[model samples]
Target chain A: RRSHTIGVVTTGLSFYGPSQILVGIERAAREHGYSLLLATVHEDPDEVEEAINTLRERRVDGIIIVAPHNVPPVVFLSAQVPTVSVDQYAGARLATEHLLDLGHRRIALITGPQDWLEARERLQGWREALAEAGLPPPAVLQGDWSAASGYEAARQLLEQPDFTAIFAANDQMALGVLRALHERGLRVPDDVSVVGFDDIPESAYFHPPLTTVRQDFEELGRQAVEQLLEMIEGEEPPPPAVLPPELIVRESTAPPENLYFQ
Target chain B: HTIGVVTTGLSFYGPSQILVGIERAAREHGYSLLLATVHEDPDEVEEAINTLRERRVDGIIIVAPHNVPPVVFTVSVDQYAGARLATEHLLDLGHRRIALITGPQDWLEARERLQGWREALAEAGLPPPAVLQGDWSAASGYEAARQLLEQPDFTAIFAANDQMALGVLRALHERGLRVPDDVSVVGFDDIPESAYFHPPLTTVRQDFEELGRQAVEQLLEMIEGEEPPPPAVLPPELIVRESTAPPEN
Candidate 1:
């Protein structure tokens, strides 16, 4: 007596990335003939358990966790229902490495709020890339993943003007960086290079356009639903999956103009 | 025995917020939601509707922001009034040469807002300036603003939505024009991030939650064998923020 229903717990639809993932989840679930019972947890761990319990009470066959923040182990440990989590990482390395390859030595970083796992992972990737390149990690600024924060961080980074490149944790921040730089009469990729993550659709339309990393949220959603369906049929779910992000080079990144002059 | 929600533009703020309201209201009344999404293509609208029907959903709520097929139980925010509110705000601020950056003409909301802007200016005994079009992206807004600057006739600009207003702000900044000091800007749809725009934003606020709640209530009423009420049109409000000001002397 399967209910043919899947419960999804996700948050932060206000941001572009999480919302696209939900679209993917809905499309895949419909294809598999399952209706979705969605519950949103407001970045609170306690609500995660409550959301799961509410879905279970509704007799959902399985659940998917799409919240980017940390989920408590106790909730998962106590819950007997089959669950699958969708997570993606590692795009930050590509962004850093791209700037590094472009001969950017003094690359600064603007990160998302350090509390978010995605932001920390991106920060780690940037650090690992810098460490492997025999360079000390450069100056770092924090942003709450908004254009305003990015603009504010870039303004602070400009007080010293040591860095020739900035890698913002996401595109919205990159937009802010672009604005701040433009206000200071700095030309992108000419005076400074910029890179952003989450190649949101508007990235291509940015002032000079933006060089960004693209996350395949749709594929991530598809895989999560596939794994959940497998668990519902009494099969052991496979190991966690990680989707690789692609780097899109637009007009935003280039060899530092100082290098040409040198 | 489920309610089908045909939504598009989830990647944007407004439609997704409305969906949140729809989901909350539907669940409160004990109905599961079957979701379907379509791309920007208008042809997909009919197909999405049929997909929901084939799924045997008891009722459907269309959350597409563009022109949707005339389904029996539709709910929406008043785009015309919202546009009038934005335009009238600029007019009241003494901007006679107000410029407009509109969304794609194909969208019903866009067309409605354009008409609202037209009529608002008409009542003031002013002919509308040549309209600039945007595809509701910050980039299009940016490009259109650059084009508008060549003429430099208008003192205030009214962008159809907040994202375009963001782009408009960037363009004005690039030209070294200060907001509300040299040029005033107004945006529609006070998205959560609109308040965080460089100068913050003066925009229209659509009650998407109410739109969602009404859609759910109406659909449920029909499902429960009650008479279908008239389609619901929720009113929009004007949020005055820092982006707008009296034109400089």
Candidate 2:
């Protein structure tokens, strides 16, 4: 009665986060004796429909969406097949609060592309954390989540020199920030504290060993497959799940130094 | 028949780029890709292959960077040449005291790379400095650079890969040593992020896409009952970026 294959629609395999999630998806699907029919779509919304249609044509039992960007609600509404999505949102708040807790007030934010759902959510979380602390958010800089963008943003931020710490949306951007600071002969944690989201594998190897928020993308993939399988078996799916993100303290962050000197 | 691709290390740049090429080529040829990921453990590799076999895939492509039992087809980049190219670039930059950061020696690619570094130095009538082994991670590169600094003899360093090179750059920065000024740093596998590394990186570039395309083509030929091509070794190129320069006198 079933094809024993689940359709997976994902994007951004070139990146560390999305690619790791795909690995988790494959690992779980194999364990449950299910095959995966993978489809990668560009950031274009229309590609999501095309990918889903192709998978449906192949008679996949269900579908999982891993696009961090916006997926049209119409695609989910129109598709008669069962579906599930893997995602993130809370890690930004955790990262911001960690910096706030370390007695950092003049904290700057380097956000991802505004169009991305994850990026917007992370920005919102940063704002919300700042509001709770009764401290006005510093001017935010935008990055396309690349080290180059992070570097450029930090260079721009240095022109103002108003902030004491920075929370980059991702590790790559954070690495760029580190480089920018180094170019100016500034010391990490000693002069400026930095915290990055997404504890990518290379983050620990960063110059000061970046402090960051860790996302369990593997767990997200595992949950998506489990839910999709449940729907295939004529069972009702549970409400969406939110995986908690944890703060990993490393060498990158320290309390604001010599606050009296300022 | 579908093509089964057993890949690992997607977190790194090389494996993922190769997969992109494999998938693109496979789709162009109207063949679907069935992927399986296993840990670096040998037992897992065998199990992954068996699973693919049971899936009725016509042929398999093993993309693990480690040694694997021969299948119908295998394609690889020239690791030795890549290392040689990286080392030779530093040499050309007027660096005489060059240190090497090698990958885990158990990996065939790692051993080949190490051999290339040794041969290049010997050809220059220079004795190789102490070799430090890294597990192909940036953290290991950082650790190795720290140890290398204790000796302070080398004027340049060639990391086995770009990630390690990133760590090398970081370690050097912490010591207040400027790249290409105080010490030249070269990396292998010009990953996309390497160009954005502080002061950028001068490194070796492996044509992983071509490696993937060739592997897919050879596998399809084997699937069609054609003669299997000889093991193909693709050449690597040197990408001179901002990381290398003549050593400061």
Cα lDDT of all candidates, in order?
Answer: 0.79, 0.80
Q: How far out, in Å, is residue B127 in model 1?
A: 3.7
Candidate 1 lDDT over B123-226, as tens digits, reads 99999988999988888899999999997998998999888888898799779999989999999888766765656689999877677788888887787777
Which one wins on DockQ?
Answer: 2
Candidate 1 Cα misplacement greater than 4 A, ranges: A68-89, A155-162, A179-192, A230-241, A254-262, B1-4, B22-34, B38-62, B65-78, B89-101, B104-108, B128-157, B164-185, B192-202, B207-249
Distance from true location, Cα of A35 in model 1, Å: 2.0
- lDDT for A242 in candidate 1 is 54
Distance (Å) between predicted and true CA of B44, model 2?
Answer: 4.3
- Extract clashing residue pairs from model 1: none
Q: What is the lDDT of residue A30 in candidate 2?
A: 83
Candidate 1 deviation (Cα RMSD) = 5.6
Per-prediction count of colliding residue pairs?
Answer: 0, 0
Each candidate's interface RMSD, rounded to one decimal? 3.5, 2.0
Report fnat, model 2: 0.44
